[model samples]
Target chain A: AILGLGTDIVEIARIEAVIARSGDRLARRVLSDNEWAIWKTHHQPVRFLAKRFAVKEAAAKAFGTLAFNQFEVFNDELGKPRLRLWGEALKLAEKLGVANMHVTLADERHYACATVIIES
Target chain B: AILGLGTDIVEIARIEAVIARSGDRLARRVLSDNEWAIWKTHHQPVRFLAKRFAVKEAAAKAFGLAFNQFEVFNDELGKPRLRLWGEALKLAEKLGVANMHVTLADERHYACATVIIES
Candidate 1:
């Protein structure tokens, strides 16, 4: 059965503008260490970063609350992005009976969007 | 195994303004009878209507079609559901779209929706 669902969209230009105003500041604040490492490897980090940002927003909505920096976005060996919850985030997932999460992210030229589904 | 996925967000005020200008005509165009019935029961009908509007947009993206071409309504449990007709139904079958599922959410400021299509 479905536990929860969330979706979010962000304009890449918006993230690009933010990066221009504050170099890597938003990344440091929102990304986990694993995600930060991935961010550094991409040549167009802003594109990838925007996708991750949207993913985090979608996940937070699925979980029904946000804990600052409590959820992490990472990729598997096959390059499928996934989520890991820590501290309060994990507790909330358990309370909601969410056993697994699936996310699909896509980016066109100027926009990035993510859809998240939490299931028992 | 995902066939296609889509999401949409709309400011409640944006929809509110459109309704202010167009009235229930917009609702009649988009909503099936079942949805219109539920829309009538809500004290803040605009909120529910906005969510359905977003859901239709998201489902159109997922199905790669126009929102006006298909039919969407609410089930007995208030879950959003979809149906296809004529050319739209033919196109969906041609593309292997077997089923669709939708989820909805809204805040005071915004209405949001997601659609996942299964082949």
Candidate 2:
């Protein structure tokens, strides 16, 4: 059976401004181990963080739970992004019968967006 | 198997302005008869319409439907879901679509949605 779908849209400037004041607080709090490592090197750090944050929020909505660091977004060699679950995030997904998940993310000058699809 | 994954983002202000300038025409045209009635009951109809508009575009991109081809409703939890009709309904039948899941989101500036159809 197919489960829920999630989509989130966030303003890029709001994230950028928040980071300016909050420093690495959000980045450290939101990104998983792998995601933070990429954040350390990505040229467009703010955009990258915004994209990941949107994905995190979208995935949580799809799962019908509050999730953050437990969810990770990573890109394949082709630079196509995929979602990996961990900790309580994976625990909830298992409980809900999430056998496969699909995600797509986008960021432009002013906004970042992401969508998550969870299938059982 | 997944048939299509569709998503869309729309500026809330842009959609609101269009509705303002077009009066009741665009809203009626975009919404089905049932949706039009729901729109009437809303306090923030502009916000409501904006999300509905986004869902339509997102679903259209997923299965290639038009404005009047689909409608969306909220469940008891206020979760968005799709109800296919006309061209969209026909296409889903022909494509052997078994399930269609859709979600909606909005903020002060934007409304967004995603659609996933599967066999």
TM of each candidate vs. truth = 0.59, 0.77
**Candidate 2 chain A lowest-lDDT run of ten:** A63-72
**CA RMSD of each candidate after superposition:** 7.4, 3.5
Per-residue lDDT tens digits for candidate 1, residues A1-120, read: 566666777778888988999988999988878778888899889998888887888887776547536778877899988888888888888888887899988888977777788887
Q: What is the lDDT of residue A49 in candidate 1?
A: 87
User: What TM-score applies to chain A of candidate 2?
Assistant: 0.93
lDDT of 2 by residue, B4-71 (tens): 98878788888779987997777888898889998888899889888888889988888955686688
TM-score of chain B of 2: 0.93
Q: Please report the TM-score between candidate 2 and the true structure.
A: 0.77
Q: Residue-wise lDDT of candidate 1 within B1-119, one digit each (tens)?
A: 45778778888898889899998888878776666787777888788778878888887788774455556665675555677765667887888876676766554566778887776
- DockQ, prediction 2: 0.53
Candidate 2 deviant stretches above 4 angstroms: A21-29, A32-45, A74-80, B41-43, B65-69, B85-95
Whole-model lDDT values for every prediction: 0.78, 0.84
Scored against the native two-chain complex, candidate 1 gets a DockQ of 0.15
